[PDB]
């Protein structure tokens, strides 16, 4: 498994930011490094940085990085469901909450592209799609949608659809819900999904239509009408 620093190969460039002005584990480049580690070492099932220093690297990130960096592991552990699913447990009960949100999405993202007769990701993320904290719910729903993109199965879709009318959920949760419903049922034009998401997008007001995440809801409709 390659190292993000080695991909940057800072060991050879003239590090003109160094000495005194490099001794900080600042958020942004740490998030970049976590994403690089996820992308480059994706699907190889192993890492040297976030396996041995799994908890330790997480401890030096902050805020939305936890929801990102932990989920990064899921890309490394792609399609070895029993591989990642044995590795996310140490974070499924993490003291940290944001990294718990990242882990709960990594569980689903590991199952992306594969279908299991057991549907393990469905089982794990079913009880957290209505979690009180927005981050937990967001991670659960994103992971579950990724784990079942293109499945078109109506149990997951009927578990997902009530979140549209769930105005108590923050808007980005509704956006992710529409995105998940769209990718789970792609191009099918199924009325059960389509009418519900149409009514969901029909009710929003001016201050809601202009907000950052509403733009995804039409896509959730459009994904159901691909081609």
């Amino acid at each position: 498994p390659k190292v993000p620093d080695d991909i940057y190969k800072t060991h050879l460039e003239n590090n003109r930011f160094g000495g005194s002005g490099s001794q900080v584990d600042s958020a942004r480049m740490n998030l970049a490094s976590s994403f690089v580690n996820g992308f480059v070492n994706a699907a190889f099932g192993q890492d040297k940085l976030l396996t041995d220093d799994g908890n330790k690297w997480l401890y030096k990130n902050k805020d939305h990085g936890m929801l990102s960096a932990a989920a990064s592991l899921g890309m490394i552990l792609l399609w070895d469901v029993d591989g990642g699913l044995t590795q996310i447990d140490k974070y499924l009960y993490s003291s940290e909450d944001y990294i718990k949100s990242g882990a709960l999405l990594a569980c689903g993202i590991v199952n992306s592209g594969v279908r299991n007769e057991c549907d393990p990701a469905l089982a794990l993320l079913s009880d957290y799609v209505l979690h009180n904290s927005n981050t937990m719910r967001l991670g659960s729903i994103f992971g579950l949608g990724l784990a079942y993109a293109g499945s078109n199965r109506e149990d997951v879709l009927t578990l997902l659809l009530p979140v549209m009318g769930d105005s108590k959920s923050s808007m980005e949760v509704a956006g992710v819900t529409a995105l998940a419903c769209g990718m789970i049922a792609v191009g099918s034009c199924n009325g059960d999904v389509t009418s519900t998401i149409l009514q969901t997008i029909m009710e929003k007001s001016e201050t809601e239509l202009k907000d950052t995440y509403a733009r995804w809801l039409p896509l959730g409709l459009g994904l159901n009408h691909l081609g």
Binding site: N55, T86, Y91, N116, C118, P120
Partner: protein, 95 residues
């Protein structure tokens, strides 16, 4: 038949065996019992395994009949690096 279910238990490819297996069992039993029996039949650690049932988690303190199991229900067995309580404790001690 006779109030017994043939649960389709799915084991990891890491333990090289038949991916889908049949386990004949009852329904009045509890979660601790199901994890223990899956462990002994397939030679796993009962405290290092988490069973997912009928698209849900095991209700460990609750009985099988209450949590929604029936005949022909799939059950994925999942290993753990620590014990199922230690899966909490290990991180719960490191701040």
């Amino acid at each position: 038949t006779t109030g017994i279910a043939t649960i389709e238990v799915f084991l990891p490819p890491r333990l090289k065996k038949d991916r889908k297996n049949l386990l004949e069992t009852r329904l009045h039993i509890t979660g601790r019992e199901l994890r223990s029996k899956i462990a002994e039949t397939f030679g796993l650690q009962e405290n290092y395994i988490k069973i997912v049932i009928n698209k849900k988690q095991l209700q460990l303190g609750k009985t099988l009949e209450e949590q929604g199991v029936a005949h022909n229900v799939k059950a994925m067995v999942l290993e753990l690096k620590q014990s199922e309580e230690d899966a909490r404790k290990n991180f719960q001690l490191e701040e």
